[PDB]
Amino acid sequence: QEDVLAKELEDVNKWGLHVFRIAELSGNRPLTVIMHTIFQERDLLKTFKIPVDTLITYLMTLEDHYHADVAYHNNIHAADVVQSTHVLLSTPALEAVFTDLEILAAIFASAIHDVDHPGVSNQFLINTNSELALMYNDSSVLENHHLAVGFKLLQEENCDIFQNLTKKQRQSLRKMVIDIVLATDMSKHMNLLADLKTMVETKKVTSSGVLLLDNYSDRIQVLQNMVHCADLSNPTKPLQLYRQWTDRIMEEFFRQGDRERERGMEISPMCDKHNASVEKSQVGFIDYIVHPLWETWADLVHPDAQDILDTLEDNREWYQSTI
Amino acid sequence: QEDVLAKELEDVNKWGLHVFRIAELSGNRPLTVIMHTIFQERDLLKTFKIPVDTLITYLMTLEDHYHADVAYHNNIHAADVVQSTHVLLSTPALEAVFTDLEILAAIFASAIHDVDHPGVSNQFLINTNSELALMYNDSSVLENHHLAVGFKLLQEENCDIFQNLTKKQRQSLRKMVIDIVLATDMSKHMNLLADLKTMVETKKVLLDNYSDRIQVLQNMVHCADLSNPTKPLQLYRQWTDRIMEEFFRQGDRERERGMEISPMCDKHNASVEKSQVGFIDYIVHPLWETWADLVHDAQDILDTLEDNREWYQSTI
Ligand SMILES: CC(C)=CCc1cc(-c2coc3cc(O)cc(O)c3c2=O)cc(O)c1O
Ligand SMILES: CC(C)=CCc1cc(-c2coc3cc(O)cc(O)c3c2=O)cc(O)c1O
Ligand SMILES: [Mg+2]
Ligand SMILES: [Mg+2]
Ligand SMILES: [Zn+2]
Ligand SMILES: [Zn+2]
Numbered sequence A: 001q002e003d004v005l006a007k008e009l010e011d012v013n014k015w016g017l018h019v020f021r022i023a024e025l026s027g028n029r030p031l032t033v034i035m036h037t038i039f040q041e042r043d044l045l046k047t048f049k050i051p052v053d054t055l056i057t058y059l060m061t062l063e064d065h066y067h068a069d070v071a072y073h074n075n076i077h078a079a080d081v082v083q084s085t086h087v088l089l090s091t092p093a094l095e096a097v098f099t100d101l102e103i104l105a106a107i108f109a110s111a112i113h114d115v116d117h118p119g120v121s122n123q124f125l126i127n128t129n130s131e132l133a134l135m136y137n138d139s140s141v142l143e144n145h146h147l148a149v150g151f152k153l154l155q156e157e158n159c160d161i162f163q164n165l166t167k168k169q170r171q172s173l174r175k176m177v178i179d180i181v182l183a184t185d186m187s188k189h190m191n192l193l194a195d196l197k198t199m200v201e202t203k204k205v206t207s208s209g210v211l212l213l214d215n216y217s218d219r220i221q222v223l224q225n226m227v228h229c230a231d232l233s234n235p236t237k238p239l240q241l242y243r244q245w246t247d248r249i250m251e252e253f254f255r256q257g258d259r260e261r262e263r264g265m266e267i268s269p270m271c272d273k274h275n276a277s278v279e280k281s282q283v284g285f286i287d288y289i290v291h292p293l294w295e296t297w298a299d300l301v302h303p304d305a306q307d308i309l310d311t312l313e314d315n316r317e318w319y320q321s322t323i
Numbered sequence B: 001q002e003d004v005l006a007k008e009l010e011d012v013n014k015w016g017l018h019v020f021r022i023a024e025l026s027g028n029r030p031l032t033v034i035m036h037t038i039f040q041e042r043d044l045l046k047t048f049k050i051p052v053d054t055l056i057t058y059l060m061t062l063e064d065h066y067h068a069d070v071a072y073h074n075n076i077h078a079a080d081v082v083q084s085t086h087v088l089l090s091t092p093a094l095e096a097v098f099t100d101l102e103i104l105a106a107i108f109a110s111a112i113h114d115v116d117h118p119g120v121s122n123q124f125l126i127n128t129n130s131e132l133a134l135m136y137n138d139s140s141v142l143e144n145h146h147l148a149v150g151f152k153l154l155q156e157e158n159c160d161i162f163q164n165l166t167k168k169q170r171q172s173l174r175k176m177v178i179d180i181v182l183a184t185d186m187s188k189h190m191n192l193l194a195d196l197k198t199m200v201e202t203k204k205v206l207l208d209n210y211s212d213r214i215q216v217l218q219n220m221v222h223c224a225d226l227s228n229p230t231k232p233l234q235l236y237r238q239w240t241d242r243i244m245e246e247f248f249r250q251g252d253r254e255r256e257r258g259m260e261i262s263p264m265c266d267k268h269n270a271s272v273e274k275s276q277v278g279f280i281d282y283i284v285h286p287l288w289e290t291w292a293d294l295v296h297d298a299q300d301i302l303d304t305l306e307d308n309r310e311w312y313q314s315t316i
Helices: A002-009 A019-025 A030-041 A052-064 A075-089 A100-112 A122-127 A131-136 A141-155 A167-182 A186-201 A216-231 A239-262 A278-300 A306-321 B002-011 B019-025 B030-041 B052-064 B075-089 B100-112 B122-127 B131-136 B141-155 B167-182 B186-201 B210-225 B233-257 B272-294 B299-314
Strands: none
Touching: A002 A019, A002 A030, A019 A030, A019 A075, A019 A239, A030 A052, A030 A075, A030 A100, A052 A100, A052 A141, A075 A100, A075 A216, A100 A141, A100 A167, A100 A216, A122 A131, A122 A141, A122 A239, A131 A141, A131 B141, A141 A167, A141 B131, A167 A216, A186 A216, A186 A278, A216 A278, A239 A278, A239 A306, A278 A306, B002 B019, B002 B030, B019 B030, B019 B075, B019 B233, B030 B052, B030 B075, B030 B100, B052 B100, B052 B141, B075 B100, B075 B210, B100 B141, B100 B167, B100 B210, B122 B131, B122 B141, B122 B233, B131 B141, B141 B167, B167 B210, B186 B210, B186 B272, B210 B272, B233 B272, B233 B299, B272 B299
8 A cells, every 4th residue: 555655656746646546545644745755856855954754743733733524625635735836836937936945935835725724714704703703803814824823833842844944044934935825815816816917918038938037026926826726726637636626615615505504694605505506616617717817827837837728628618518 | 089080081072181190090991981981972872872881891801901011002002092083083174974883993993903912013023933923924913913802802791882783884893993903003104104195185175985984094093093292292201201111121122032123122222302303204294294184174283293393303
């Protein structure tokens, strides 16, 4: 079983990794083994003098703080977003654009970006007067919480994977991770996409053909959109992966809708199991959210993401054909 | 003693209220007695069916969560900002332009806007890796905490002063209070002033959209927060003595930690008088001159600020 796990992890640079199989083969430790594999692949332990036992201890504590009883926003989602960000960071149009610290920030941000997610949305938490929404003044409630937990766990015993960064490196990494995870709030999607479109329309490329990003605002904008694309990458994956993700988010959504219905609340979009059309909802999700975002990312890195976009478009056609 | 307190509160509608006297005669309850007076002055208990016992219970609990061992950011500052907003709200040029709910929000936001303040700055909390900064991801750390405490206290026994607001009214009030208190973060001052300037350049004599009206309310409570240099000099000097005690204690902690000492916090290299002229020239007067242009009613306030700047300059 360890042999089969190791073979599957050889695919870590590939879009469409068998992440659900890795979750099973690793004993429900997909986030730990995928993060460890990616850190070895990118030589991040050596670069940042991360002790291996510290990395594994932190990753296993981080993974523990995802909820195994939440169908979608769990450690497998986190592992998937990590691995998807890792692939997007390797795209030819971004070669040697980002520093090792920025790479570390994007991957760490992906790993923590949904930690301790309770399986209900920000609006649900706001409208039910939850303790989380009271703490965070109704503003990026979940995303602030994910950051606070992900950083606080670094202070547990033998968990500070950043123990050997300089003070300036720690300060820069913390700021970038915050900026990235806050951009995963879906209420920011339209403004994030609008800004990404502006960047594509005005983009500059170097003599080597890679993207030119010469200020923090542009650099962090690209990393924010990269992790947001990774977060919204399920419809761009091979259909058997996409369908499993859809089964899971519909389970989580319907359970939130059941709580809304029981409380006499208006049921959130896609959350009413009695008035649901999963197929129509996926075509709409792709048409109005996922394809506008990914076609813009594809333009930013053209032609690198053409196969990903093609898969998205094929999956949209497949779902539409079932209507 | 109770009779003298009642007579001091007769000036609740005037700039320059004797708030330190009121703090003394109240048994250190200036926030509770001044909020109660202003609520009764504005008929807010009957209007929002606020049980008077519930108002008092909430106010006393809120006041208890201001730190009595913090020289400036305490319940007397809260009471002063409440009363200053109350005076700015009754500006003739703003007559009947805000609803009773928005008035409630501006006054409530002022009352809670610094609650549970530890007497050190956001940058201090960030650079010391505090629990507060870990909770709030280095972003408006104190202001987010002030809001969270002020609202959480409504859930204590017999403290829900908004119990008879409709569900929509509570949602709207909550949003406006958050928008206002988050705007008291001093790192937002320049952007807030820039937008107030844009509003003055386009002023109609009248704010039609919520964006503009919340912007005025944000700037109004920010002016009230930065109103000490516009008060009668005897009050302003007391406020300056208090904030310099708080600043010097923070700078002592920064020095001992080996941190950069924040502006005005190094007692061994301080000039309080030069600091005040700089504070007025670069922050307070540009803000209040813009406000006075918006309400062109604030002339007596701006005059006092300019008088006080002239005096502090003369002490150099
Ligand atoms: C359109 C509205 C109201 C909200 C956007 C929104 C969408 C998702 C989401 C994520 O991953 C999916 C994966 C699938 O495979 C299928 C899916 O449908 C989804 C989703 O829907 C999660 C949100 O938290 C959220 O806000
Ligand atoms: C210049 C920097 C670094 C920060 C500006 C800044 C200034 C104050 C402040 C408030 O009320 C005062 C009252 C007085 O009577 C005299 C005073 O000097 C002050 C002040 O200075 C409070 C801040 O929270 C803050 O950030
Ligand atoms: Mg999320
Ligand atoms: Mg404050
Ligand atoms: Zn996510
Ligand atoms: Zn204040």
